[PDB]
Amino acid sequence: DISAKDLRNIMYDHLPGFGTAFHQLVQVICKLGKDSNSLDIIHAEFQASLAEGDSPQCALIQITKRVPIFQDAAPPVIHIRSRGDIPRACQKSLRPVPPSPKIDRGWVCVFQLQDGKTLGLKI
Numbered sequence: 001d002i003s004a005k006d007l008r009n010i011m012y013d014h015l016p017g018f019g020t021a022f023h024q025l026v027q028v029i030c031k032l033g034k035d036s037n038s039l040d041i042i043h044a045e046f047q048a049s050l051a052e053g054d055s056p057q058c059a060l061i062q063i064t065k066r067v068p069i070f071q072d073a074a075p076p077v078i079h080i081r082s083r084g085d086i087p088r089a090c091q092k093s094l095r096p097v098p099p100s101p102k103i104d105r106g107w108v109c110v111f112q113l114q115d116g117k118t119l120g121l122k123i
């Protein structure tokens with residue numbers, strides 16, 4: 001059975017650059033997918049979108065809209081030390097956190113810093 005690590009690697013293989021907001025979205029998809037035993041359907045939706053000609057970025061977004069565990073779901077809160085622990089390619093995608101962020105509206109995750117600061121990662 002496909003593991004979260006393997007799915008991450010498969011999805012990363014299709015992405016340009018590294019440590020981008022789409023890479024973090026892969027991590028969030030794999031994490032929530034693993035916790036809901038849904039890695040198989042996520043992988044199948046990913047492959048199906050690619051096979052139709054969608055960009056890998058669009059395929060990842062379509063997963064957040066097509067796989068029921070992501071529908072109307074809040075972004076995971078991720079505790080970190082400083083803004084530095086966030087990858088360089090994500091820095092310009094960080095925003096103040098909106099009242100009710102949703103993954104299927106492009107809010108990938110909420111980073112929670114040590115001092116109480118919080119930032120939402122937006123696609």
Ligand SMILES: O=C(O)Cc1ccc(N2C(=O)C(O)=C(C(=O)c3ccccc3Cl)[C@@H]2c2ccccc2Cl)cc1
Pocket residue numbers: 004005027028029030031034076077078079080085086087
């Ligand atoms: O393979 C699995 O069993 C599923 C899995 C487990 C952990 C990760 N993560 C990391 O290893 C990691 O560094 C996570 C981050 O989102 C992160 C991104 C930047 C800085 C610090 C962190 Cl902790 C990231 C992570 C950690 C906590 C909550 C959500 C996520 Cl995506 C992803 C998938």
